[PDB]
Amino acid sequence: PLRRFFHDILHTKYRAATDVYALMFLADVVDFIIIIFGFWQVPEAFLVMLLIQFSTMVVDRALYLRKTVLGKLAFQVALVLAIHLWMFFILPNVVAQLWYFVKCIYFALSAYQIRCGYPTRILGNFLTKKYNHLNLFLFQGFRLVPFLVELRAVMDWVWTDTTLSLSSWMCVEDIYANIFIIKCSRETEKKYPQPKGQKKKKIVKYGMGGLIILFLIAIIWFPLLFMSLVRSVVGVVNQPIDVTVTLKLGGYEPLFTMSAQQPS
């Protein structure tokens, strides 16, 4: 009975509504990062933990986009027990202590989501809320992460109720992304206007240009340098330890094996 009452009051209740998915995902990103960094049976363990962080993040996205408090309850319960049971499978550590710690933060923010509820407006990219410079840089960085952009799109499509196909979902995502980047730039130009016909600031030019040139230098010259440096190192003294002179004389029985060694 009591357990049923607890669960009823964790589902039906009368609480508020917060969106702490951003922070939950950030906790899981930190977790992923430290497990990736913590490659140090061990490779197999770290590879299983990789697949795990990933799978759990995907399930979390599902429950967030489907606004399931009951689903989040179930996931939390399972995950708590499973991660705590993985402490018993230590057989393949500061890295693991930190992984536990950051996963504890994820469990705390997840527990908050369940006990608060899911807010009506869940859609909308976190880094496209304001149109400043920080939002711009963060968004572009998210787009630079190998597969985050595409994963987000496909995943969201699968959960969110749409009439459009993946092709068309990706179209509206691309349009929005580009439009946001343009908006941020437009906003910053309104905030900090540049006089009409004001060169381009010698220093700015020198910086960007210099970096590009140096990057190009490191495409051609640097590899050559590294290559030559490593290959050049050659030469380890090799001296005959012994002087074995066998003066094989007799055709039938070769002898005369008087010879010497290192002392001589």
């Binding site: 410079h133 711009l136 840089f137 572009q140 787009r143 580009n178 980047i181 343009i182 730039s185 437009r186 910053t188 600031k201 220093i203 700015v204 910086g207 960007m208 970096l211 590009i212």
Partner: peptide, 21 residues
């Protein structure tokens, strides 16, 4: 003498070299 104003300028314009504006 790279000022902070110059530093943001540089960064944003390299971002424009890759990303739009």
């Amino acid at each position: 003498c790279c000022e902070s104003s110059d530093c943001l300028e540089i960064c944003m314009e390299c971002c424009g070299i890759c990303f739009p504006s």
